[PDB]
Design a protein around this nucleic acid. Structure first.
Ligand SMILES: [Mg+2]
Ligand SMILES: [Mg+2]
Ligand SMILES: [Mg+2]
Lengths: 201, 139, 483, 50, 71
RNA sequence: AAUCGUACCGCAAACCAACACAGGUUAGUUAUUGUAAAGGCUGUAUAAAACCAGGAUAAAGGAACUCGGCAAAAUAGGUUAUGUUUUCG
């Protein structure tokens, strides 16, 4: 249930970088009429967050992630915003909000960014060309594009073999061992029964 | 005789309520049965010792039968082998409690979060009705 | 890099992998399946499927002497298969050949029917039929160093530890190296095919039968006995009619049986099958053609090999012959007779050491399975039944089973006083009085027989013994007096 | 290093070194017991209890 | 400590993966008792001799375990 | 199948140090990628002296300090064509 800003031009996004409130008066009035009149502003707009602040943010991320998976090449943030809104309707308002969602995906390796090549660090810092983003069909354990991921895995694979044989040569176990800890108690048994009941219903 | 005890006072187990022997503060595995506030001398004594945290799937465990098959024939190695088996059994009692405490913490956090969402919804709905009245009164 | 709250996925990939490898009970499996089934990659989704059939059997064995299995478990086992079956279909397009083998086998082993999986397998079987039956085909290679973008969608390489892999040198002069993989998939398709996916499965198998028949070469490593049985039953269940393909399949089975007997020296000992011995190694596993000596490791707790049979055994001969009876009309009589004679030679040679008889243990279920096929095929032989009776314990069998065994021995013209005595002695010890004859129960049959039913069993046993011609003995005399 | 920790209690050591069974095993120990009887000490050995 | 020098002893649940039976076989449509009686009667009473067996026959020998290649 | 141990403290305000002592005290287990589940614990009332202790920043110069680069600071890490010395490692 998206809500429009007092300018009636876009929807407000659930993040700390949003500086516009949601219009909630029963009647539609221009901003200039009531903003300078001196009346309390809370009578016209809601400056707070919704009760489902965390759940809405998670839903928006899934919409962005699914759209990227349907794409076949990296695209800009502007294209992502237009594509999501066209498919589902006016649910996202700004490109900064989408960028924040993408940063979370990049941190956890759910997406990747293609960066340009620059001759000097200062040119890279001052560059203003938009970036391109892609998505991984499944979560990976390495950063970068699929070509970069393959290179990183190859280095990791070599290191693992190097370490395992060095341990064997120095009279250590090739593979570390642990003990199995029991993590199934009476609480877990009752959770499983609850899960079956919900699934049946 | 049953294999496991099923009638526990859960207020006592979690720690909100005192036990039948308040002098004991941390019951041992074999002391849980008699510290239970719902102890009764008419109930048959279980054939095995389990804490209240054990799952109901432990009734099919037979640990000493398996130990005998793995028993080394050298007495010196046998004594050490037995010592580690007793260590394994004792530790299993406190793995169940740790899982019990972590599992309940997650359920509590979910329920507390759900209540927080409902309270905010009621407050926002009440304010909206008040706001509407102001506009209607002013015509 | 994976710290904080993930707005897309509820559980980290690495943690989910840990839980899957740590499963020992169905309740623990249900906890994982019912929560994160929508976030498994093909590597994780297929691993769960393979474990489930083994977890169900484990719980059935956890029951103590005086207890019974919880009735709520079997319903939950099939519930988990259905949920994982749906996820298998969703990620089916990103699986490898080996991963598809695991998922298909689990459903086929559990006898769970799923239309979505059957349709997906039907298309895959068509694609693989023209690729794995080509002469210029190479074996599957697990030594991947720089995966392609499509290989990153299998989830194998999203790991924080070393990925185990085979260390063998792949053959470079093999013909149809992946025939066994195709045979298993086809059998699974027939078994998993449902009511709304039967037509698609049959059509895909018919194309495979035509391609298999129109082939002028044999795989360099002959297909395993298990694979041959699976393919034969794939045609039998699906109703594929192709005598050219059927005859060729039985030819391969005949060739393998002869090869095993040709390369066997009786002086060494009783015939035993050739097997693959798989051992754990630093970088993975290694397959050998012969066993190692027992070894003591400073780090591993178990150095025993995993034995994967390749030649025929009594278990597999009872399934291949069963398929032959179903497909009798499509097999020439000459080929059927040759296979039957080879089966008898395999059985006789497997239970003889030096110049003396050394019986090999068998179960009652196995004996009945073999005999049932022979009765349908009308094959009578004493060289195939005598070894089976020497190795059959007769202490926990019901009275009815003993009577049936005696009748079977007489019909097959078995000439061994020891076998007859071991049967009559066991039957006499089970026939009790009180003035009503009572025949005891056992593994062979369900329930006890009293009155006329007990008398009928005794009469049949006496008739078989009389035709056999055994000299009078105490056990037979008591039975006759009671009856 | 910090001093003053020359006593490290051990029940088995105390009984073996100063016990009644030890005092009665030698002539000199028996003379020690007599000296303590003559002076009239209420407890004869560290090992004594009722 | 947390790091073990070798694999721990098998004290936890052990799931067995040996001797798994999943092959297809025929049904239980065997002959009736009357048919067996008729077949036995039809048997010719051939006066043949018994085979020469060893005085002592060893009891049945257990079979070795088997695994599957779906690793 | 009898007999003895089972409460409470146990890196500590309960044990060894005369103390509620910044010291001493064995083994077994647990969460955590860049972090970290369970559990556990908690400080009389103020501030815009000198001086003392432990930190932070500092123009221009850079050992001129001092018995002495004491103390403090400092790209500290990895791979190198070539050269030197070797008991040739
Ligand atoms: Mg205590
Ligand atoms: Mg300065
Ligand atoms: Mg100077």
């Amino acid at each position: 249930r998206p809500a429009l800003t007092p300018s009636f031009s876009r929807v407000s996004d659930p993040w700390t970088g949003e500086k516009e409130a949601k219009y909630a008066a029963p009647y539609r009035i221009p901003e200039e009429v009531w903003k300078n009149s001196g009346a309390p502003k809370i009578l016209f707009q809601d400056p707070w967050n919704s009760p489902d602040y965390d759940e809405v943010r998670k839903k928006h991320a899934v919409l962005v992630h699914d759209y990227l998976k349907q794409q076949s090449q990296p695209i800009n943030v502007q294209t992502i915003l237009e594509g999501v809104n066209k498919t589902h309707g006016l649910v996202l308002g700004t490109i900064e909000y989408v960028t924040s969602l993408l940063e979370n995906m990049l941190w956890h390796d759910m997406a990747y960014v293609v960066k340009p090549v620059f001759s000097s660090p200062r040119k890279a810092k001052l560059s203003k060309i938009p970036l391109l983003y892609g998505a991984n069909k499944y979560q990976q354990v390495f950063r970068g594009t699929p070509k970069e991921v393959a290179e990183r895995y190859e280095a990791a694979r070599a290191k693992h073999i190097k370490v395992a044989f060095t341990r064997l040569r120095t009279s250590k176990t090739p593979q570390p061992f642990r003990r199995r800890t029991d993590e199934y108690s009476h609480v877990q048994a009752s959770q499983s029964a609850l899960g079956l009941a919900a699934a049946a219903a | 005789r049953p294999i496991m005890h099923k009638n526990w006072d859960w207020e006592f187990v979690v720690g909100a309520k005192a036990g039948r022997k308040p002098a004991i503060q941390r019951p041992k595995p074999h002391q849980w049965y008699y510290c239970n506030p719902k102890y009764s001398a008419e109930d048959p004594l279980p054939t095995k010792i389990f804490p209240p945290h054990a799952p109901p799937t432990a009734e099919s465990l037979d640990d000493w039968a398996k130990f005998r098959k793995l028993c080394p024939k050298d007495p010196v190695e046998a004594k050490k082998f037995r010592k580690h088996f007793v260590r394994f059994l004792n530790q299993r009692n406190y793995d169940w409690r740790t899982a019990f405490e972590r599992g309940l913490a997650k359920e509590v956090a979910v329920a507390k979060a759900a209540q927080r969402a409902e309270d905010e919804t009621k407050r926002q709905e009440a304010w909206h009705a008040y706001r509407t009245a102001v506009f209607e009164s002013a015509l | 890099f994976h710290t904080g709250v993930n707005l897309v996925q509820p559980i980290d990939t690495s943690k989910l992998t840990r839980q899957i490898k740590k499963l020992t009970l169905l309740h623990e499996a249900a906890l994982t399946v019912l929560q994160y089934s929508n976030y498994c990659n093909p590597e994780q989704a297929t691993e769960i499927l393979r474990r489930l059939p083994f977890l169900m059997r484990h719980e059935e064995s956890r029951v103590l002497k005086g207890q019974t299995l919880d009735p709520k478990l079997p319903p939950m086992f099939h519930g988990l298969l259905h949920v994982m079956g749906d996820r298998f279909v969703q990620v089916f397009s990103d699986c490898n050949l080996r991963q598809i083998e695991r998922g298909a086998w689990a459903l086929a082993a559990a006898r769970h029917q799923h239309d979505g999986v059957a349709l997906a397998l039907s298309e895959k079987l068509k694609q693989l039929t023209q690729e794995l039956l080509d002469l210029n085909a190479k074996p599957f290679n697990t030594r991947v160093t720089k995966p392609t973008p499509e290989q990153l969608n299998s989830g194998i390489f999203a790991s924080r530890v070393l990925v185990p892999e085979s260390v063998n040198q792949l053959p470079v002069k093999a013909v149809l190296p992946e025939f066994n993989a195709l045979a298993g998939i086809a059998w699974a398709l027939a078994t998993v095919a449902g009511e709304h996916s039967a037509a698609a499965a049959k059509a895909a198998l018919e194309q495979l039968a035509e391609k298999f028949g129109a082939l002028q070469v044999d795989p360099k490593p002959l297909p395993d006995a298990d694979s041959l049985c699976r393919l034969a039953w794939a045609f039998a269940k699906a109703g594929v009619h192709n005598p050219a393909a059927v005859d060729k399949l039985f030819h391969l089975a005949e060739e393998r049986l002869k090869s095993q007997l040709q390369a066997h020296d009786p002086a060494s000992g009783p015939l035993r099958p050739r097997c693959t011995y798989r051992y754990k190694t630093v970088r993975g596993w290694v397959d050998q053609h012969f066993p190692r000596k027992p070894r003591d490791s400073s780090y591993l707790g178990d150095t025993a090999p995993k034995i994967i049979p390749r030649d025929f055994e009594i278990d597999s001969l009872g399934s291949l012959l069963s398929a032959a009876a179903l497909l009798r009309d499509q097999v020439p009589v000459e080929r059927l007779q040759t296979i039957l004679n080879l089966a008898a030679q395999h059985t006789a040679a497997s239970s003889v050491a030096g110049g003396a008889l050394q019986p090999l243990m068998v179960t009652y279920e196995e004996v009945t399975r073999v005999l049932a096929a022979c009765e349908q095929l009308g094959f009578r032989s004493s060289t195939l039944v005598t070894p089976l009776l020497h190795g059959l314990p007769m202490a926990a069998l019901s009275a009815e089973a003993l009577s049936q065994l005696a009748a079977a021995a007489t019909l097959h013209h078995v000439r061994s006083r020891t076998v007859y005595l071991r049967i009559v002695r066991a039957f006499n010890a089970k026939l009790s009085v009180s003035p009503t004859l009572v025949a005891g129960a056992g593994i062979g049959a369900e329930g006890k027989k009293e009155g006329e039913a007990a008398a009928a069993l005794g009469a049949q046993l006496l008739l078989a013994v009389t035709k056999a011609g055994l000299p009078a003995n105490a056990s037979v005399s008591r039975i006759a007096s009671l009856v | 290093m910090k001093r003053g920790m020359t006593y490290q209690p051990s029940r088995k050591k105390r009984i073996n070194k100063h016990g009644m069974e030890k005092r009665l095993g030698t002539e000199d120990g028996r003379l020690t017991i007599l000296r303590r009887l003559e002076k009239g000490r209420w407890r004869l050995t560290v090992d004594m209890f009722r | 400590a947390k790091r073990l020098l070798r694999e721990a002893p098998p004290f936890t649940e052990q799931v067995d993966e040996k001797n798994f039976d999943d092959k297809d076989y025929l049904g239980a449509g065997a002959m009736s008792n009357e048919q067996l009686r008729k077949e036995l009667e039809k048997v010719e009473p051939g006066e043949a001799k018994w085979d020469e067996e060893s005085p002592l026959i060893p009891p049945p020998q257990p079979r070795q375990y088997r695994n599957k290649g779906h690793q």
